[PDB]
Design a protein around this ligand. Structure first.
Ligand SMILES: CC(=O)N[C@@H]1[C@@H](O)[C@H](O)[C@@H](CO)O[C@@H]1O
Ligand SMILES: CC(=O)N[C@@H]1[C@@H](O)[C@H](O)[C@@H](CO)O[C@@H]1O
Ligand SMILES: CC(=O)N[C@@H]1[C@@H](O)[C@H](O)[C@@H](CO)O[C@@H]1O
Ligand SMILES: CC(=O)N[C@@H]1[C@@H](O)[C@H](O)[C@@H](CO)O[C@@H]1O
Ligand SMILES: CC(=O)N[C@@H]1[C@@H](O)[C@H](O)[C@@H](CO)O[C@@H]1O
Ligand SMILES: CC(=O)N[C@@H]1[C@@H](O)[C@H](O)[C@@H](CO)O[C@@H]1O
Lengths: 121, 121
C-alpha cells in the first residue's frame, strides 16, 4: 500500500525532502538534477535551478514522453513556473491540482522515464 | 493519498530522488539533512552522511518521538544501517517491511516531526 505516516509533535514549519530541480535539455531531457544530484547524460543545455520556497510545491506538471522524457514543465502552488524544457516529440500528459512528493526515474544518456509520486487533490 | 504515475520508456538505470541523509543530534534530533539540505536547528552533533546505492532503500525504520523526534535509526534492503542517533526520550515506533519513498517533516530549532512516505508490504 502507498501511504504515509507522521511521527512527532505539532510544532515547527513544514519542509519537503524534494528541494530543487534543474534539467539538461535539447530535443529531449538529457538529465534531471534533483537536490543537485545529476541523473542522465551531459548532452543539451543546463537549465537554471528551481528551488522550492517554504510551503511551495509542484501543483501542476506537464510531461511529454515517448521512449524518453521529451519535455517537462511545471507550476507551483505559488504560481511560479519551470520550463517548458526539451522538445516537441512524445505525447503530453498532465497532472493538475496535485502536491508532488518525490521524483524517481530511470536514466542513461538521456532521461528515459520518470516515476512521480504525488497527492491528487 | 499517495499515488504514482510513470512516464517514459523502458531504458536506462533506475534512480531515486532520495539520495542522502545525515542528522544533527544530542538528546533529540536537532536537524535532518536530506540530500544536503539542512532542516532544523544548530544544536547537537553532526552525524556521518548515509548515501543510498542503486536499488537501495530504507526497509525498516525506528523513530522515537514525543513533542519532537527524539531518535532515528534505519536499515536498508541491503542490510546497511544508519543510527541510532539521538536520545532515549519519547516512545518508539517502528516501520517494518516497507520501502521509504520520501522524507518530509516539520522543523524549528529541532526536528519536530517526520512525514514518511512509503510503500507498506
Ligand atoms: C545540436 C543540439 O542542440 N544537440 C542536442 C543534444 O545536445 C541533445 O543531447 C539532444 C537531446 O536533448 O538534443 C539535441 O540533439
Ligand atoms: C512514434 C513515437 O512514439 N515516437 C516517439 C517520439 O515522438 C519521441 O520523441 C521519442 C522520445 O520519447 O520516443 C518515440 O521515438
Ligand atoms: C548501454 C546503455 O547505457 N544504454 C542506455 C539505454 O538503456 C538508455 O535507454 C539510453 C537513453 O538514456 O542511453 C543508453 O543508450
Ligand atoms: C551539550 C550538548 O550536547 N547539548 C545538546 C544540545 O546541543 C542539543 O541541542 C540537545 C538536543 O538534541 O541535546 C543536548 O542538550
Ligand atoms: C511526557 C512526555 O511524553 N514527554 C516527552 C518526552 O519524553 C520527549 O523526550 C519530548 C521530546 O519528544 O517530548 C515530550 O516532552
Ligand atoms: C516560532 C518558532 O519558530 N518556534 C519553533 C517551534 O514551532 C518548534 O516547535 C521548536 C522546536 O523545533 O522550535 C521553535 O521554537
Amino acid at each position: 500500500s502507498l501511504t504515509h505516516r507522521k511521527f512527532g509533535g505539532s510544532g515547527g514549519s513544514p519542509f519537503s525532502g524534494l528541494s530543487s530541480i534543474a534539467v539538461r535539455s535539447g530535443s529531449y531531457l538529457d538529465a534531471i538534477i534533483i537536490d543537485g544530484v545529476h541523473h542522465g547524460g551531459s548532452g543539451g543545455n543546463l537549465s537554471p535551478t528551481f528551488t522550492f520556497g517554504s510551503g511551495e510545491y509542484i501543483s501542476n506538471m506537464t510531461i511529454r514522453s515517448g521512449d524518453y522524457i521529451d519535455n517537462i514543465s511545471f507550476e507551483t502552488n505559488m504560481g511560479r513556473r519551470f520550463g517548458p524544457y526539451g522538445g516537441s516529440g512524445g505525447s503530453a500528459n498532465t497532472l493538475s491540482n496535485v502536491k508532488v512528493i518525490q521524483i524517481n526515474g530511470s536514466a542513461g544518456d538521456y532521461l528515459d522515464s520518470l516515476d512521480i509520486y504525488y497527492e491528487q487533490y
